[PDB]
Amino acid sequence: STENGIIFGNIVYDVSGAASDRNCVVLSDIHIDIMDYIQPATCTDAEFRQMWAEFEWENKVTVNTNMTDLNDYLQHILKSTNMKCLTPEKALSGYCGFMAANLYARSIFGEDALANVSIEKPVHQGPDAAVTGHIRIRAKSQGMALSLGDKINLSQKKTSL
Amino acid sequence: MLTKFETKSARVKGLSFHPKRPWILTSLHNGVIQLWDYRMCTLIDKFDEHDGPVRGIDFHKQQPLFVSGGDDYKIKVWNYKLRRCLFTLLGHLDYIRTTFFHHEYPWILSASDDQTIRVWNWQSRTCVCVLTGHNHYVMCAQFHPSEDLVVSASLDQTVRVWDISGLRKKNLSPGAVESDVRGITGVDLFGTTDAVVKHVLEGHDRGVNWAAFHPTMPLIVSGADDRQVKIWRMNESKAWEVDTCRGHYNNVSCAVFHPRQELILSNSEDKSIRVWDMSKR
């Protein structure tokens, strides 16, 4: 509880200089992010598609670039955000695949977020060590939504924070 | 390098920057007093001190507190931090421009925009000082070099410099040679705001918007109710010191010294801030 709508937290906080102390720390937080919050959540595909289109379209971020195949990479990202890819078609996340992966999640304060990311995928002189897949992010406010696309973008790779 | 935050609003007569904090406390004549402890781009509080206008802002001198003045005519000191009112007296027939805090017996000075300013004992109850020598409507009231020596700027077209006492105003002296306040080539006029020859300096320049002091010094840097903002040094007292500070188009509401910077910053009304030296000027 306690709604405060100061998004991403990052709200000023006080420790005060009020006694053996002349100053102290006033701080705003940072360090308060999304990837964690949302839990995986699920859907019927036809309805899904319909829905996918239907949803708050308004955010997307791109996937392109990493350190891994989207097998290990995808798993890693998935676990990191604690979120769902709804369903496979065996077409094949292996030989290429030339697979677009649909992901859904529902959070602790209940937003459902929808993705279709469509991605190249690693494999010798076939394709995938980048993507150039587009991550399409729908979350109700664009501001969190895009931000989520980012957040995930942060999540995507593994490097010096 | 960066102008971190910027929205044009507020119609601002009185102003102060936190010598300790990156606060700006701002007085509008919207009737508003505001403290924003400017750092986190956030206002702590905002009280429109009364229905009438607000001209004054001054420091208590401590760390984070305001002493405030409105057309209420009241000296309030309220601590933002402690969100409470320290000791209270209202004001005469005009608002409070400057304040200083002292403490033999935790003791107090209040500087005012009207008539008198009175300095009060709430401990071993006696009189430290009485200041008469103001009339109405003080634009910029000031502590001097000696902090508890002072200057005031008026819409009564005078300037007052006063001498105080621990039992009201007086000074004892007998050694000097000539004076720069008044004693050789050039010098600017007395005004009338009080009635003792300390120096009441002429605040006529259609009236004086601001007065600013030179710490050990008596040079003043001024805002004036003339295009002419006229600069005088009473640590010299030049001729072509009958300087009118000139825009292109009208005014020079103020022009000011920056403690550190040996410079003058001018600001005016053709849509402008005008840039001035004062190191070689």
Swiss-Prot record, chain A:
Name used for this protein in its record: Coatomer subunit beta
Tissues with expression: Predominantly expressed in the upper one-third of the oxyntic mucosa and in most regions of the pyloric mucosa. Ubiquitously expressed including platelet, liver, heart, spleen, lung and kidney.
Taxonomic source organism: Mus musculus
Subcellular location per the Swiss-Prot or TrEMBL entry: Cytoplasm; Golgi apparatus membrane; Cytoplasmic vesicle, COPI-coated vesicle membrane; Cell membrane
Function: The coatomer is a cytosolic protein complex that binds to dilysine motifs and reversibly associates with Golgi non-clathrin-coated vesicles, which further mediate biosynthetic protein transport from the ER, via the Golgi up to the trans Golgi network. Coatomer complex is required for budding from Golgi membranes, and is essential for the retrograde Golgi-to-ER transport of dilysine-tagged proteins.
Subunit-level organization: Oligomeric complex that consists of at least the alpha, beta, beta', gamma, delta, epsilon and zeta subunits. Interacts with CAPN8. Interacts with SCYL1 and PRKCE. Interacts with COPG1. Interacts with ARF1 (myristoylated); this interaction is required for binding of COPB1 to Golgi membranes. Interacts (via trunk domain) with ARF1 (via switch I region); the interaction is direct. Interacts with KCNK2 (via N-terminus); this interaction increases the channel-mediated whole cell currents and promotes plasma membrane expression of KCNK2. Interacts with STX17. Interacts with TMEM115.
Domain of life from the UniProt record: Eukaryota
Further remark: Brefeldin A induces dissociation from the Golgi of the beta-COP and presumably the other coatomer subunits.
Swiss-Prot record, chain B:
Modified residues (Phosphoserine): S173
WD repeats: from-to residues: 7-37, 49-79, 91-121, 133-163, 203-233, 247-277
Compartments (UniProt record): Cytoplasm; Golgi apparatus membrane; Cytoplasmic vesicle, COPI-coated vesicle membrane
Superkingdom, taxonomy of origin: Eukaryota
Modification Phosphothreonine, positions: T185
Subunit record text: Oligomeric complex that consists of at least the alpha, beta, beta', gamma, delta, epsilon and zeta subunits. Interacts with SCYL1. Interacts with JAGN1. Interacts with TMEM41B. Interacts with SVEP1. Probably interacts with PEX11A.
Function field: The coatomer is a cytosolic protein complex that binds to dilysine motifs and reversibly associates with Golgi non-clathrin-coated vesicles, which further mediate biosynthetic protein transport from the ER, via the Golgi up to the trans Golgi network. Coatomer complex is required for budding from Golgi membranes, and is essential for the retrograde Golgi-to-ER transport of dilysine-tagged proteins.
Protein's UniProt name: Coatomer subunit alpha
Organism, scientific name: Mus musculus (Mouse)
Full-sequence range covered: 1 to 281 of 1224
